[PDB]
Symmetry: C4
Subunit: 387 residues, 4 copies
């Protein structure tokens, strides 16, 4: 990234120089130039033909020749040529930050446009400098006034050519300026559109479903809740096939990331706080994420229970016989199903979702195999299972 | 949604204030301001730094200070700052309505552009206010005339700078205004294009088929009818894999929606009018939607029949031996195949599609299993089967 | 389609009327109006509130009232309102022709823009009509000159407001005109882009392959020929999974299309000229399309042959022992492999592709099963097999 | 391609002629025309109605008629008509080079626009030529000044109509010019956007993964390295299912390309330098590309080894017992696993990835089957296996 920071400095220096150069026609400054070349010399150190290019730009010219003994204007070009290296700078910049395509283009266009306007105004002056001797800020300002007004397509008509020469130049400018403006629009369009495309991809599935529903002419009562369903899922990203998605990752780091995912749900549950990491790993691999909606009878009392439900998110009602006696308002970090699973029994209580619930589920098969191995952590939750 | 309605009110108030503020330079109104702040105070109630921000905007300032004892212009800024909260308002708005991306952007640009034009005109005046004392509506109007003409890229050239100061300001304005216009185009492009993309997705499949047909150089006689085939299917949405599509839905509500789909074809058929809902559910799950074209020999007399055809949509000809005697012009809500299926027989009559027909089909296997269970509804249609 | 032709007529009539109406302010014509309403009356026949709308437009007004006894200008509006029905006309038009989205939009914008310019110019006149009595063509022309120049963003600055009233109107116009122009661009962008998207889809696969090749850094010698390979395939459409593609078609018409495909390769081959259609159908279903490249040793003499090759397109060299004696320059409509397949033998000759070759292949299994059934067409080619 | 080069020449000639023609109104040149037609005559040789068209353009007209005996202006049209053939030229051009869609459009628009401006200026002159006799360069220049200023939407307002006639023409021009400019933008937008789409496709997968990670709220420590992982893969193209990708290629050339891929990794390894090509082919088909990350314990000493690892790219540490004694710093072109695989043993040493490593892997099964066949190349590496 530091290498990129170096690029930024150099870039700025080049830009400044390209503005100072063309002005030649009409102490500290000298010291500034020393700095410029000095920086360029450091660039050479940072680094065939490219060497030659950099070398040339870094050659302390006019000053040197001044101390030895329009031409300085001509010499100014030596620092301009270097600009071509931007093609590699950009690559490094993208590598550094990785932004949305077009953003960088926008920056470049702003840069180029700026230079164009400046040089064009100078050219205008040149033509009219032949109508005088020297000029001041007022003239330069006027040149820009005309220049910009023309480039921007506005055209106040305040200033116009008198000779064919001037007319010709004007025509040249009009063509170029128009093109520039068009390309500006180009970026804006491409950038903005691409942003929309990204969002469209996200909604893709839900949209298809909605379309279907519309074809079936289903009432809003449901369709709205359907959309919401997908929206929430999208927010969580749980709808993604985590497994298959991760399956393209180098198994080494893949597992490390998987461990990070194990970290995501591991801390809340005291069982896992007091579990070993081989267990945690094994189990995390096993655990499946299930979504329940408000009111869902997750467990039905009397029915054979074959899975542990670890409540990541949401509120749950553990109800006895009467389906009213909330035995437990079961919340994030709690866990249920253990009574029936450890006892190899039917659910001795009913379990209702209060809210929408995110639960990690552990089938009896996995539960038994895992805690067969981890019999000390079979002994663990079995402890609590007594009540 | 009410929370969003509150946002709308606040938004409007802010906008109004931002127009009244900059005008400061050249009773009821006071009461209006009371209302404004009052509303903002309610916003505080609706709700750290954001508190401070709202607080500031809601501070009844100039009036207070007037009763205590250019500056009022300065104080007006206190209500402007708050505008930043739009970033959250927008989120809520989208959540509320969920419109096509870009539409909201368009609105925002209209809003911002409006303010820009207003403030810019004021700035113009300021520069030329230094050329006078006070001004009236005519001057304000003229300012807008110039401002808009410039921003819109038109440029009549009626009004122009005289001093460099003015020229500079003008250049600034030209740059900004041009950019604004460009972004306006941006939205229009992105919005319109996205609309086309949606439609393209719909035709995607048919288009591929058409392309194939064109490669094979098939005559219009067919290709047109092919397109129509797909068009109709699209209209109905029947081409969608309803099952797989629905398979990503929380089984609870999924089933409820499935029930809504059961509702869609359940009422017409008297068998199902007089069926129980366990049957209906079971059967609805079983029923498959089949499309027949005009003239199709759905049944052939003499051939083993192994399915019930419930006519959702279209006209059908039940023909005896001679293939002319329309035993029954069978229409929406009618059903056929029951004779052979209940009798375990061959079709004792031929069945032709009059029109295009949407039929829900029940295989003999499902039919028998279902009505084995629902033997009272086996007894039911079997009643009618006598004729 | 005739119904659509009727729409076209009506549309045109409406347009004309909307141009004649606003002109009111400054014999045959009367008869023309009779025609207009007459046409609208027929439209009523072609057809609640829509009835009322049409009715109103078809009411022969000013003339009637003239014979009974500015106001006529006012009455002209009665034919304008009807324009709203375009929303349904467009649907019918698309159904009729089915063109690329955006094309229709372009037409609509041209239509609307035209009307806007006209009405705007009239408004301009109105404002300045208050500065005079009556005007002629010259004034109308001038109005358009200003109007268009403004709308098109050009702005010559030749004509400008003098009163605030005029300035206000101008500002209104500038805003509207600018917006119009922007929307024009919108269509152009969306249309053109969509065209590119279509082509991109076509090249999609080949492009992916090319990308791979570029990553592998393979020489042009191959990559070019690879591209060509895909290009040719694309041209033919043979790369499409015809089967799976067709598998979404109503089996009835699907088969009919399949028959059309059977027609495509059936005529050339005398075997099939003199075959029955049950065979042709059966066989066509069986035949598989295979592509060979120049030089390919399709058959190798001595090797067990288990397939018939029916040459759709290209040139083939049947070579004996020496691989030089072209036993047969085998061309489109010819067929080979029959000797070995009928004789249950090894290829007694070698077969080379001269050119790229499109061949329909018939495995020995299918060949035998088919011509087991069609033993008379087993006897057929077996006849020729003698040599 | 030469045929295309011929097109280029002809195209240029046509263009030149279309500029010279309209100028008619106000020696060597004659010889130039001879050349023009001559070239067109050659075109006829390069080649019904198209013959007639070319013929006409190639007819040496004005000169002929001059030697026989405004009208010449009229005759100039004979070379213009031919331009229509561009529709076929373009096809050939694309076939020749195959560039990004839109690029060619851009060229065409530049071409057409140029001609429009020229002809329009002439028309302007014509109108004002009726106000004089003859004109010179200055007038022509002025015409262009006005023309371009108008077309480009700038509009200085320096020149304007005086008669209605002129006003009308102007209006016509304004409309056309505006449209042209719009279409210019169209291309720019479509081209630029399509470029972005290509890149988006490339990042598609990684982006999806990143999105997931963001939803899971994983730290940068990993996400950055994840992106890098994909980036590198993309750079290499190794993530592509080479097999399946290639599976759509004509097996003949497909294999040849496969051989090119065999060439890609074949040379480094002395085993394969001194192997036969049947082996190389067989083996290359077998070899699988595997990626290891820095630090990866590729082999663990003591564990059963069942695969040969041929190091395409990267650095590897062969470590004995102590996991420090780098037995071999194993680099590109080296190979490991052979000791255990030839000895049917456990890894007698541990192997760590120094860097990221690209390795082609050969399972023991394939290894044994291959070198069972190629027992002389089983004897080969087995030689070295001694140490």
């Amino acid at each position: 990234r530091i290498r990129v920071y170096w690029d930024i400095l150099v870039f700025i220096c080049i830009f400044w120089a390209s503005l100072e150069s063309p002005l030649r026609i009409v102490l500290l400054l000298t010291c500034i130039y020393f700095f410029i070349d000095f920086v360029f010399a450091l660039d050479i150190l940072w680094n065939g033909s490219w060497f030659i290019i950099d070398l040339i730009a870094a050659l302390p010219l006019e000053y040197a020749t001044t101390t030895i003994f329009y031409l300085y204007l001509l010499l100014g070009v030596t620092r301009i040529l270097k600009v071509f290296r931007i093609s590699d700078i950009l690559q490094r910049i993208n590598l550094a930050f990785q932004p949305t395509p077009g953003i960088l283009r926008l920056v470049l266009f702003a840069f180029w446009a700026t230079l164009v306007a400046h040089w064009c105004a100078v050219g205008w002056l040149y033509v009219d400098d032949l109508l005088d001797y020297q000029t001041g800020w007022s003239e330069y300002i006027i040149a820009l006034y005309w220049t910009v007004a023309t480039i921007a397509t506005v055209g106040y008509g305040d200033i116009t050519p008198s000779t064919d020469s001037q007319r010709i130049y004007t025509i040249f400018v009009m063509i170029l300026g128009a093109g520039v403006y068009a390309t500006v629009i180009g970026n804006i369009a491409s950038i903005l559109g691409s942003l929309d495309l990204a969002k469209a991809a996200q909604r893709k599935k839900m949209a298809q479903v909605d379309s279907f529903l519309k074809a079936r002419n289903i009432s809003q009562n449901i369709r709205r809740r359907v959309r919401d369903y997908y929206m929430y899922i999208i927010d969580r990203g749980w709808g993604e096939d985590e497994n298959a998605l991760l399956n393209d990752l180098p198994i080494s780091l893949r597992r490390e990331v998987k461990i990070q995912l194990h970290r995501d749900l591991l801390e809340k549950v005291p069982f896992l706080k007091g579990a070993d990491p081989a267990l945690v790993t094994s189990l995390v691999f096993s655990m499946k994420p299930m979504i329940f909606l408000e009111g869902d009878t997750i467990f039905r009392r009397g029915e054979k229970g074959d899975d542990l439900y670890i409540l990541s998110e949401g509120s749950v009602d553990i109800l006895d016989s009467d389906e009213k006696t909330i035995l437990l308002s079961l919340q994030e970090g709690q866990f249920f199903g253990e009574l029936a699973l450890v006892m190899d029994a039917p659910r001795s209580a009913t379990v209702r979702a209060t809210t929408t619930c995110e639960i990690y589920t552990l089938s009896k098969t996995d539960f038994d195999n895992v805690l067969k191995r981890f019999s000390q952590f079979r002994s663990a939750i079995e402890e609590s299972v007594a009540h």
